[PDB]
């Protein structure tokens, strides 16, 4: 064990990768949400290029 | 409470306007006079302590334990530090002993064996410092329960709650009947878990279980020999066998 | 989210014409003809149905 890395939502390493709309609604998630942000202490952070 | 016309009986604080009112006559006696709350190298003392709390954070990080447990662990040490009766003792043992206590104080003890995993201190010395702290801080403790470790071990085996819960009853029934007045409750619990796992498709070898619990594989076998006479009746009434109790293995 | 019960400008009752409107577009009608088969002749009452987005059918997907 070394540590813990944050995970950007809807990536290939998220729990929402490749799900269908019948399952995205079952976890109380929006099928239209784009993804691409982190969840850090409840907040939603986005990185600026 | 006072007024020029009468000794005041009550002086309400009106936070909203920030005023002090004396209702029974009518005269603000205090004006704008009640604030409303509303709503390293330099360190010499508390420096080896600070290092010990960084090292306390490290010990509690190897297990990722919630800050509330560590919060009182730091407080326990500070207290133990302040008395300094036990000042001439190794800090890391005290930290580790503080840690064992906090888990018990949170009603979720971790085995010394576990506590040893994250520290260099011998279980013997942790237990010695532990006693000294109990005497130092003059506070009582609690007895252990098997079910408190049913969760993570069964988790570590990824066993379903039904097996996990069945084991707990088996354990619970066994201790109420004192079927095992000798073997450590964890040893007793593991055999119950074993029995439970042996009562489900999620069977595991004693050595793997033994490896997870840390107890000797013969100690489980002995503990198993003690619980086996009542293997059938020890199971909960809400259970679905994968193997008949008759077909439960012997060792 | 749900069809209003009254046109904002006239006051004519619209809230009972949403299912019949979908039923006419269902077969072959153009939006210009379905609105005439319902009796909406002022362009303030046709804006009501022509530009309505029905969000209530997507909030019924979340289990209560």
């Amino acid at each position: 064990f070394i540590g813990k890395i944050p995970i950007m939502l809807r990536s290939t390493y998220c729990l929402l990768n490749g799900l269908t709309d019948r399952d995205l609604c079952e976890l109380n998630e929006c099928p239209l949400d784009p993804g691409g942000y982190f969840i850090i202490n409840g907040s939603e952070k986005v990185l600026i290029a | 409470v006072t007024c020029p016309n009468h000794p005041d009986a009550i002086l309400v604080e009106d936070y909203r306007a920030g005023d002090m009112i004396c209702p029974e006559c009518g005269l603000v006696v205090g004006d704008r006079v009640i604030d409303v709350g509303s709503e390293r190298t330099m360190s010499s003392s508390d420096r080896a302590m600070m290092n010990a709390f960084k090292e306390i954070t490290t010990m509690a990080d190897r297990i990722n334990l919630p800050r509330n447990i560590v919060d009182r662990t730091n407080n326990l040490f500070k207290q133990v530090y302040e008395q300094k009766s036990l000042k001439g003792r190794a800090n890391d043992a005290i930290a580790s002993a503080c840690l064992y206590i906090a888990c018990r104080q949170e009603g979720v003890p971790r085995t010394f064996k576990e506590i040893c995993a994250v520290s260099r201190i011998s279980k013997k010395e942790i237990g010695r410092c532990f006693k000294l702290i109990l005497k130092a801080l003059e506070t009582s403790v609690d007895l252990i329960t098997t079910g408190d470790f049913m969760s993570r071990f069964c988790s570590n085996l990824c066993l379903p709650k039904q097996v996990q819960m069945a084991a707990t009853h088996i354990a619970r029934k066994a201790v109420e009947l004192d079927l095992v007045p000798g073997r450590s409750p964890i040893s007793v619990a593991a055999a119950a878990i074993y029995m439970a796992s042996q009562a489900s498709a999620e069977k595991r070898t004693q050595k793997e279980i033994g490896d997870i619990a840390g107890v000797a594989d013969v100690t489980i076998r002995q503990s198993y020999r003690l619980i086996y006479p009542r293997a059938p009746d020890l199971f909960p009434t809400d259970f679905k066998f994968d193997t008949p109790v008759d077909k439960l293995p012997q060792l | 989210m749900i069809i209003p019960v009254r046109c904002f400008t006239c006051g004519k009752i619209v809230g009972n014409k949403w299912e019949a409107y979908l039923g006419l577009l269902q077969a072959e009608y153009t939006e210009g003809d379905a609105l005439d088969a319902l009796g909406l002749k002022r362009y303030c009452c046709r804006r009501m149905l022509l530009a309505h987005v029905d969000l209530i059918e997507k909030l019924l997907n979340y289990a209560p």
């Binding site: - | 936070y15 920030g18 704008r32 604030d35 409303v36 509303s38 | -």
Partner: protein
């Protein structure tokens, strides 16, 4: 037609449907007043609450 007197309006008015939006700045959030309110403690200057 004029709404108060029913007379016609000499000019012809340009009318039609457009798409408006409602911005976030409402007036319930920007009104505030002070009249002999709470004061600080060290410098005795007016303070909020």
């Amino acid at each position: 037609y004029n709404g108060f007197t029913g007379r016609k309006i000499t000019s012809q008015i340009f009318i039609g449907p457009t798409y408006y939006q409602r911005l976030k700045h409402m007036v319930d959030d920007k009104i505030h007043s002070r009249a002999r309110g709470p004061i600080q403690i060290l410098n005795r200057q007016p303070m909020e609450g």
